[PDB]
Amino acid sequence: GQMRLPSADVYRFAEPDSEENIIFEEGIPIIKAGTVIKLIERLTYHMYADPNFVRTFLTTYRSFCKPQELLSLIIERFEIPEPEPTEADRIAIENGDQPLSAELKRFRKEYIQPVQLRVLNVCRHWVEHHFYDFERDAYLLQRMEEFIGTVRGKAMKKWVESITKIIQRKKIANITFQSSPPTVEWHISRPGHIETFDLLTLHPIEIARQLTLLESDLYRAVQPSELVGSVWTKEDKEINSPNLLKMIRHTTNLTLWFEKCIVETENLEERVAVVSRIIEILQVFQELNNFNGVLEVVSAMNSSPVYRLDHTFEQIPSRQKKILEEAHELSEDHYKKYLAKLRSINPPCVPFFGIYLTNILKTEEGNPEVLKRHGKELINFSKRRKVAEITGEIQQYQNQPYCLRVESDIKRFFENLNPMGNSMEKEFTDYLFNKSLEIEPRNPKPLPRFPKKYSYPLKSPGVRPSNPR
Amino acid sequence: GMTEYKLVVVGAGGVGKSALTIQLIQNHFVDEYDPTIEDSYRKQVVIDGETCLLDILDTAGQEEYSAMRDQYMRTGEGFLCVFAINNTKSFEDIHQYREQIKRVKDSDDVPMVLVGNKCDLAARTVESRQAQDLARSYGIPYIETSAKTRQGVEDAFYTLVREIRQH
Amino acid sequence: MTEYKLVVVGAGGVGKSALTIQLIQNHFVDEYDPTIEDSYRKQVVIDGETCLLDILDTAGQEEASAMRDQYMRTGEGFLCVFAINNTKSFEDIHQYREQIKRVKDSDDVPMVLVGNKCDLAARTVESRQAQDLARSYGIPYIETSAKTRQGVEDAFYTLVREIRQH
Ligand SMILES: Cc1ccc2[nH]cc(C[C@H](N)C(=O)NC3CCN(Cc4c[nH]c5ccc(Cl)cc45)CC3)c2c1
Ligand SMILES: Nc1nc2c(ncn2[C@@H]2O[C@H](COP(=O)(O)OP(=O)(O)NP(=O)(O)O)[C@@H](O)[C@H]2O)c(=O)[nH]1
Ligand SMILES: [Mg+2]
Ligand code: NA
């Protein structure tokens, strides 16, 4: 038979399941909705572990339970009463013999020890992967340190001593590869001559590599805390989502730099060379699976100032027209081909973040926080699972590092890029559009001629890498 | 077969813009949504007795990718320009959204509707007369919608389709 | 994308977590933080086919030994890890092998025998003894180092191939 449980009057987590406190989806069960008590029971269930659920719960719980209250509830879960001696134990003791304590021993082995270890696993995941709760509430951290540091008894001792050390390390807080990274490539600009760095003077291969390292680092720095609750759209977004916003602002700046390089090149022949070079950078982005970089280029080519430059795009080689067209097709039909390509490639990659943001926001906005059943309000956990499926996908692509060498001067050049200068956005984008009208006027105005601005060769070195001994 | 209309929702972030399309496309009568599902943004409808397919692009949440707006806007035949009735700044943004649409589409007469969205119970700061006057100055319809009761949602999209049909 | 459920089992301290984190993050963990249960995901192209690996990293400490049936039921394939400088961990392998066979009620479960810490000179389990055991199970034997990456991809991706051909 099943183990008997403590009275629900002394231990709240022994109340029987009912549709008034938990609802399952239609081989471990998947929870659609429940009370916070039932969610925590299943988070730390004696019959099975549910590591996905631990991640889902710790990522999303603040929408229905405060951090201080979560800690109180898992401490309450941990403190399980032991059953009294049975009739057979009583009779043995009355005869001066040692009781077998069979029911007590089974309850310890199959209920107390698994539940307690799974509570500690929640604590361990909380500290290791969601430490921001403790960075933002020093008293919460004190309570966690006190709880862990006062767990007695030898069955939990190894993990209690370990979690104590992990907490202390997190308070005061290296890559190996299958091969060597390829050699850094140089074109007109030579190493150390940062004053000459520009779109056409750096090697297009190395532009794409260094932007990919930068954009990968920005992608990898975004934590779920910047996403749950749609906080990057709210009034405190600069406080709550700074790494996400830094990543987006880099993408915007690079797109605008591409547009500025194009329309400020007034000579037609030179401007064709500029556009052709940007499409070569896009080709290397594709080879590197840097989809953020691919769409940075596509966004620039589709911008109002650039899209209308028919005289320029007429002279682009056919093979480059095809590269740009197949990159543009990734975004068509609501990113259908992009989504399929992302799910097919071999990482490392840099995803485009915008789709994730829209899906998290619409999942939050389109589903209710609670479900009303039998007069009770149950937490709608299915909504939180959907959000955590998205944050889990994001995290999966954050793991794999690029095997490319940093070039510190090229990295600094792109970190310091500032195409808008001190201008406001409307000012600047109106300037770009007026430049477009200057260099290729609306029909029937005649096409003017403009002097060259570059004194160095415009011929591209190409995007196939070289390898000296 | 039936005509497909490519509609684009534009407007300030953080003020409930996404509720318009969610409420339209939703199981009208079950409050639930999975935006990741293929064709959670396509809906077959009958407008004035003529069946058509709406394909709605709503990039809510991507407002900070400001250099992508041109690309997203060029996909559209008609536009819903959305502001929140309790956020004056989102109303003041409308002029620049309209100017950007006209530039991207290279036309002074692009099908569009102005939508004032009530996204919570916070106090209204844009009166309906202010929004009606703005819409009239542009020559476009004005529709007010609730983000909670679905009121006005069908009217906003159907009015835009009629603007496309009568262009 | 086909999804594969891999489970990493073996005695405490043999390097199950270090192997998994090396595969997932290309990083070697120096600390010895005993695992309760952790799970990882990895998209990777293997033999030209994209798949999604779900990797369950399990507890080796004996205090968790009564909690294994629940994860053995869900796993498709098992990495059975010992450390080549720890003869007791090698003797513990057969207990994991027999429990997996009981739980899954099968003599034919995808498995790979892994001898970890092969960067260390002071070996106490000879390759031949481990290879003999592997042959008796019908499974391959791969020596690995979570520290240097030697053999790490080979161990995990060989297990994927076993599940695929099962
Ligand atoms: C791919 C490509 C390139 C140059 C090209 N010249 C001519 C063509 C053939 C096409 N049928 C044609 O007449 N197209 C129009 C005139 C040329 N622009 C190019 C353009 C600017 N920004 C873009 C962002 C994305 C894409 Cl896909 C394209 C562009 C598009 C409109 C062509 C095709
Ligand atoms: N030299 C060397 N040390 C290793 C290797 N793999 C793991 N270690 C070290 O061995 C210790 C235990 O590693 P760990 O991955 O925690 O082992 P585990 O099998 O996961 N332990 P548990 O079962 O308790 O979770 C750590 O100090 C780790 O750095 C290896 O390949 N070489
Ligand atoms: Mg471990
Ligand atoms: Na206001």
UniProtKB/Swiss-Prot annotation, chain A:
- Which residue numbers delimit the Ras-GEF domain? 203-442
Tissues where the protein occurs: Expressed in gingival tissues.
**Segments forming domain N-terminal Ras-GEF:** 27-171
- Name the linked condition: Fibromatosis, gingival, 1: A form of hereditary gingival fibromatosis, a rare condition characterized by a slow, progressive overgrowth of the gingiva. The excess gingival tissue can cover part of or the entire crown, and can result in diastemas, teeth displacement, or retention of primary or impacted teeth. GINGF1 is usually transmitted as an autosomal dominant trait, although sporadic cases are common.
The free-text function statement in the UniProt record for this protein reads: Promotes the exchange of Ras-bound GDP by GTP. Probably by promoting Ras activation, regulates phosphorylation of MAP kinase MAPK3/ERK1 in response to EGF. Catalytic component of a trimeric complex that participates in transduction of signals from Ras to Rac by promoting the Rac-specific guanine nucleotide exchange factor (GEF) activity.
How would you summarize the oligomeric state and partners of this protein?
A: Interacts (via C-terminus) with GRB2 (via SH3 domain). Forms a complex with phosphorylated MUC1 and GRB2 (via its SH3 domains). Interacts with phosphorylated LAT2. Interacts with NCK1 and NCK2. Part of a complex consisting of ABI1, EPS8 and SOS1.
Name used for this protein in its record: Son of sevenless homolog 1
Q: Which organism is it from?
A: Homo sapiens (Human)
Q: Which residues of the full protein are shown?
A: 566 to 1046 of 1333
UniProtKB/Swiss-Prot annotation, chain B:
Q: Which PROSITE patterns match?
A: RAS (PS51421)
| Lineage of the organism | Eukaryota, Metazoa, Chordata, Craniata, Vertebrata
The subcellular localization recorded is:
Cell membrane; Golgi apparatus; Golgi apparatus membrane
Task: Provide a Gene Ontology MF annotation, just one.
Answer: G protein activity
Protein name in UniProt:
GTPase HRas
Tell me which Pfam families the record gives. Ras
Changing residue 62 to K: reported impact?
Answer: In NMTC2; somatic mutation; increases transformation of cultured cell lines
Q: Name one GO biological process term.
A: negative regulation of neuron apoptotic process
Q: What is the effect of changing residue 33 to F?
A: Loss of interaction and recruitment to plasma membrane of PLCE1
From the record heading the sequence, give the disease linked to this protein: Costello syndrome: A rare condition characterized by prenatally increased growth, postnatal growth deficiency, intellectual disability, distinctive facial appearance, cardiovascular abnormalities (typically pulmonic stenosis, hypertrophic cardiomyopathy and/or atrial tachycardia), tumor predisposition, skin and musculoskeletal abnormalities. Congenital myopathy with excess of muscle spindles: Variant of Costello syndrome.
